[PDB]
């Protein structure tokens, strides 16, 4: 079937249609390796948080629900960070400056609020995985352009030889700043809504 893991990639993208993961999309997308690691972390954390929130969704009072959800999310992220620091030290060094951004990524909390609080556990897990895939689509597309045009590299591998290295390419210094990410996301949304006219916002 697999009709649920693929909807939030193009039809219900968390960044292009919902506005839910923007800050890290601006932060981590200068390198494809960092974007890939962040994609995996967000997808894993959202899946597990959705599962655990749906497991106890019928016992959560409405006046402590934010506290319950955030306690679960923060505990998961902290445990993952400790495990990475103990067993995957290099990956941990990659994600160390961004660990606190994973907790406040609006995708995790928004999917727990919108879906997990009213859905079944396995569907909530699948929803988390699919929204992570849609997040990673945008992250990898933006990081491709940013890394290639700002450093002539893809995943750290030399693609465009630089003038300082005896090559011909002069890196673009605006690709190492946030405005380039803003513009790339805007043009990506333009293309997506050109191919999906149903997502065009009404003139009224």
């Amino acid at each position: 079937l697999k009709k649920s893991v693929l909807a939030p990639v193009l039809d219900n993208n968390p960044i292009a249609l919902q506005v839910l993961g923007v800050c890290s999309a601006l932060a981590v997308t200068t390198k494809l390796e960092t974007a890939f690691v962040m994609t995996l972390a967000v997808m894993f954390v959202t899946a597990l948080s959705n599962f655990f929130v749906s497991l106890i969704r019928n016992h959560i009072p409405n006046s402590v629900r934010i506290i319950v959800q955030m306690a679960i999310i923060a505990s998961l992220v902290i445990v993952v960070d400790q495990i990475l620091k103990a067993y995957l030290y290099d990956i941990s060094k990659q994600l160390s400056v961004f660990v606190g951004l994973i907790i406040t990524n609006c995708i995790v909390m928004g999917r727990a609020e919108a879906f997990a609080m009213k859905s079944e556990p396995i569907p909530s897990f699948i929803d988390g995985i699919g929204n992570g895939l849609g997040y990673g689509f945008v992250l990898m597309t933006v990081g491709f352009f940013r890394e290639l045009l700002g450093s002539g590299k893809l995943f750290g591998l030399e693609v465009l030889p630089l003038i300082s290295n005896g090559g011909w390419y002069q890196p673009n210094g605006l690709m190492l700043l946030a405005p380039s990410a803003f513009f790339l996301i805007g043009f990506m949304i333009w293309a997506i809504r050109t191919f999906k006219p149903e997502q065009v916002e009404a003139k009224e």
Partner: protein, 198 residues
């Protein structure tokens, strides 16, 4: 006095939470259509930050700091969960305040009201305060100034989007994509303070 004025100006302009540091972007891009809605959300964010930074200052300095309670005990692995718990309780109270007294703003916010908890600027401000080792008074001033800068940013974006009623934007860009472009141009404008030390 000059110390706190310098800190306040730095928090508002030199280290603006939105057009520097690029934090709290989701509601900044979504809820900037109307100046008055943005103004109310900015007031709410100011209040939350101004209570959050000093309370987490006290909690860190009395409980979570190394050797704060018992010699040889850290408890600093609980920082993030404690900080987010404080913010979550505050937004829980703010939700019923807005439901009782400000129904228009409560309805305009929608699903973004409970997501004020994970507005990245508030958690980032608490973290910056702990990194910089502020005092209680410095925490109060810093949380207030960071909120003020974020509100100034969103109100300016709402003013531009209101002037853009005369624009003719292509349909694929109408709304979100053009707002992304607008925020990028705003960041360009704010790069005027990049190398000043305040």
């Amino acid at each position: 006095m000059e110390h706190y004025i310098s800190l306040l100006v730095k928090s508002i302009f030199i280290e603006n939470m939105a057009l520097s540091f690029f934090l709290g972007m989701c509601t900044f891009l979504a809820v900037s259509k109307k100046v008055k809605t943005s103004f109310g959300l900015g007031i709410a964010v100011i209040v939350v930050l101004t209570i959050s930074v000093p309370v987490n200052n006290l909690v860190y300095n009395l409980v979570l700091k190394p050797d704060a309670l018992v010699e040889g005990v850290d408890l600093s692995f609980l920082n993030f969960i404690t900080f987010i718990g404080v913010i979550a309780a505050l937004v829980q109270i703010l939700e019923m305040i807005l439901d009782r007294f400000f129904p228009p703003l409560y309805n305009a916010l929608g699903i973004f009201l409970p997501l004020i908890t994970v507005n990245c600027a508030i958690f980032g401000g608490v973290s910056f305060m702990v990194q910089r080792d502020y005092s209680f008074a410095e925490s109060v001033v810093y949380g207030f100034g960071s909120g003020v800068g974020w509100m100034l940013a969103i109100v300016a974006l709402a003013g531009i989007r209101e002037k853009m009623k005369y624009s003719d934007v292509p349909p694929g860009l109408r709304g979100l994509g053009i707002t992304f472009i607008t925020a990028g141009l705003m960041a360009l404008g704010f790069m005027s303070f990049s190398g000043v030390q305040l």
